[PDB]
Paper text:
Based on the structures of Pikm-HMA with AVR-Pik variants, we previously identified a mutant of Pikp, named PikpNK-KE, that extended binding and recognition of this NLR. Furthermore, the side-by-side comparison of responses in N. benthamiana showed that the additional mutation Lys262Glu in the engineered receptor PikpNK-KE contributes to enhance responses, without affecting the strength of binding to the AVR-Pik effector.
The rice NLR pair Pik-1/Pik-2 recognizes AVR-Pik effectors from the blast fungus Magnaporthe oryzae, triggering immune responses that limit rice blast infection. Allelic variation in a heavy metal associated (HMA) domain integrated in the receptor Pik-1 confers differential binding to AVR-Pik variants, determining resistance specificity. AVR-Pik is one of the several rice blast effectors characterized to date, and belongs to the Magnaporthe AVRs and ToxB like (MAX) effector family, whose members share a similar overall structural scaffold despite divergent sequence.
Residue numbers in the entry:
A (entry chain CCC): 33 to 111
B (entry chain BBB): 186 to 197, 201 to 262
C (entry chain AAA): 186 to 198, 201 to 259
Write the structure that this text describes.
Amino acid sequence: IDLSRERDPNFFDNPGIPVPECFWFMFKNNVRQDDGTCYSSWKMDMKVGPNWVHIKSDDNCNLSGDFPPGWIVLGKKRP
Amino acid sequence: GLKQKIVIKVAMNCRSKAMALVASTGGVDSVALVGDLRDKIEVVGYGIDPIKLISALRKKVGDAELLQVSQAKE
Amino acid sequence: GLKQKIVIKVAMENCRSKAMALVASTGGVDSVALVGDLRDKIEVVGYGIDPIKLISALRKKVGDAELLQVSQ
């Protein structure tokens, strides 16, 4: 898995709220399943295969969460 | 974080119908088709019940799955 | 073919929901966002949106509607 060489997510930034700092990508056995944006130094709840996962973002858009086996979601800088 | 961001996968012209239904919900600031296949609706607003929204979608458009709930932040 | 951003000011007195439904249902629309402090402007993004028909629709079915912006 390599995020430098992942196509930028198809996103829409609501003008009424701050722009999210991070792109994110969801994989099951490294096969990209999903993507979108998120705020860094923040959190979201995401459906990851069968389970809801409370994903934490640090200020470098690194994403920690208790991912089910064979699943991961990875975060990163937006230009 | 008074505003919610909700991402919903919809079996989806179903896009226009799904978009109209969510757009018509109370408290909505924005709806956007997102993802590479444009098979997802991201809604931003206030006082949106995701459960009622998913129910509305399933009875009206077709299969729908809550994917993401997060707050907006200032 | 080109990615268009269109901003329309609409009277809207819950005429907001009807207006957002209409725009959101229009051909080629990717996003609809209420903008301005009073949420009295609709911002539309997409491909192949016809702003003339969109304005006609909004005047016909919601009320006074004004083109503030078209960009791409």
